[PDB]
C-alpha cells in the first residue's frame, strides 16, 4: 500500500485531478502500449501517443482493425484512428473515439525528441 | 507567421521603430478587409507581433538605463528590487549583526563551545 504522506488516496481528489488536467498533463495519461513486435525492438513498454503513429485496436467492437491516428483529441481523452469510423444515415462518416489504453502501437513516428524519449527509458533503437 | 523575438534583438533601436510602423499599416489594411468578408483570422498574429516588437523595444531601453545608473546609489524606483513593502523596510543584513563592542568582546571572549558527554 501507500507509504509517502505527500500522495493522496482520496477518491474525490483523484477524479478531480483527472478531469481537470491541462493538456500537457493529459499527454502522459494517453500513453498506449507497444506491440510484442516493437517492445523487443525498442526495449520499452508504453509511449505517449502521437498523431502519426500506426496502431491496432485490441478491444471492443472495432477489435482487429488498424490504421493511423488522425487527431489525438485531448479534451475527450480520445484518439481518432482513420480506418476506424462509422457512417451516419445521410452518408457523412464520423470517427470513432478510441481510448489509447485499448490500442497497440505497431509503428512509431520518430523525431529527435521522440528518439530522445526512448533514450531516457532504457531503449536501444537500431 | 509572426516575428520571432530573438531575431529582433539583433536589430538596432531605430530599425525596430521602422519595423513597427510597418506592422501598424498592416492592421489598417487588415481591419478594412475584416468588414468585407465574414472572417479574417490572419489579423491575430499581426497584432500579437506588434506586442513582440514593443516588448523588445522597451526591453532595450530599460537595460540601457540599468547601465547609466549602474554601480551607484539612487536608481529609479521601478528599476529597484520589488520584493514586498514589508521586506524593503527590513533592516539589511549589515544592520542586523551590528553589535556593541562590549558584546563583540563578550562574544569573542566567551562564545558557545562544542562538547560531548562520554568519558
Amino acid at each position: 500500500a501507500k507509504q509517502s504522506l505527500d500522495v493522496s488516496s482520496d477518491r474525490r481528489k483523484a477524479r478531480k485531478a483527472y478531469f481537470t488536467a491541462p493538456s500537457s498533463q493529459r499527454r502522459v495519461l494517453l500513453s498506449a502500449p507497444l506491440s510484442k513486435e516493437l517492445r523487443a525492438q525498442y526495449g520499452i513498454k508504453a509511449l505517449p501517443i502521437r498523431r502519426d503513429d500506426e496502431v491496432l485496436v485490441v478491444r471492443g467492437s472495432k477489435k482487429g482493425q488498424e490504421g493511423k491516428i488522425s487527431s489525438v483529441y485531448r479534451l475527450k481523452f480520445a484518439v481518432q484512428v482513420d480506418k476506424v469510423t462509422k457512417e451516419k444515415v445521410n452518408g457523412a462518416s464520423v470517427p470513432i473515439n478510441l481510448h489509447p489504453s485499448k490500442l497497440v502501437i505497431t509503428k512509431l513516428h520518430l523525431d529527435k525528441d521522440r528518439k530522445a524519449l526512448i533514450q531516457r527509458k532504457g531503449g536501444k533503437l537500431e | 507567421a509572426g516575428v520571432k523575438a530573438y531575431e529582433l534583438r539583433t536589430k538596432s533601436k531605430e530599425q525596430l521603430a521602422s519595423q513597427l510602423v510597418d506592422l501598424k499599416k498592416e492592421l489598417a489594411e487588415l481591419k478594412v478587409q475584416k468588414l468585407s468578408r465574414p472572417s479574417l483570422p490572419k489579423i491575430k498574429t499581426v497584432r500579437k507581433s506588434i506586442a513582440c516588437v514593443l516588448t523588445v523595444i522597451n526591453e532595450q531601453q530599460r537595460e540601457a538605463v540599468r547601465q547609466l545608473y549602474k554601480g551607484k546609489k539612487y536608481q529609479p524606483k521601478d528599476l529597484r528590487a520589488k520584493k514586498t513593502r514589508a521586506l524593503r523596510r527590513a533592516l539589511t543584513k549589515f544592520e542586523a549583526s551590528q553589535v556593541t563592542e562590549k558584546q563583540r568582546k563578550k562574544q569573542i571572549a566567551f562564545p558557545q563551545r562544542k562538547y560531548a558527554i562520554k568519558a
Binding site: - | 489598417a28 489594411e29 478594412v32 478587409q33 468588414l35 468585407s36
Partner: protein, 71 residues
C-alpha cells in the same frame, strides 16, 4: 455612411474615444495625405466614437475611399 462618401465628399471613421477633433484632423492628414475642412464627432450608443471628416474641395473622398480597400 457610404452614401455620403459617394455624394457629400465625407469620410466616416471609427475613431478612438480619447481622440479630439484636433488629433483627428491631424492624423487624417498624416495617414491618408488629405486636407480637411471640418470634423464632426459623436459617440455611438455602443460606446464608440464616430467621426465625419469632410475633405476639402481639392479632393474626392470617393477617390481615396477605395484606395484603402473599402467602397
Amino acid at each position: 455612411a457610404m452614401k455620403k462618401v459617394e455624394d457629400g465628399n465625407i469620410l466616416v471613421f471609427q475613431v478612438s474615444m480619447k481622440a479630439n477633433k484636433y488629433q483627428i484632423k491631424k492624423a487624417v492628414k498624416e495617414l491618408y495625405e488629405v486636407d480637411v475642412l471640418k470634423v464632426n464627432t459623436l459617440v455611438r450608443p455602443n460606446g464608440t466614437k464616430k467621426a465625419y471628416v469632410r475633405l476639402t474641395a481639392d479632393y474626392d473622398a470617393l477617390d481615396i475611399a477605395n484606395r484603402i480597400g473599402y467602397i
